[PDB]
Amino acid sequence: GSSRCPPGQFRCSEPPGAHGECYPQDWLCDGHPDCDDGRDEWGCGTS
């Protein structure tokens, strides 16, 4: 399986590439927001 490891060094205001495989970006778009305000999962929460 490819070595997934997208970028994710922002300030927690926009998930570039979610993939705990490398970066904690996974946190983003998961279920609950954990950023400045909570946009890392904005377009993720709502079904």
Curated annotation (Swiss-Prot):
Cystine crosslinks: C5-C22, C12-C35, C29-C44
Domain (LDL-receptor class A) ranges: 3-46
Locations listed in the record: Membrane
Biological role stated in the UniProt entry: Responsible for susceptibility to the retrovirus subgroup A Rous sarcoma virus.
Protein name: Subgroup A Rous sarcoma virus receptor pg950
Residues included from the entire protein: 26 to 72 of 157
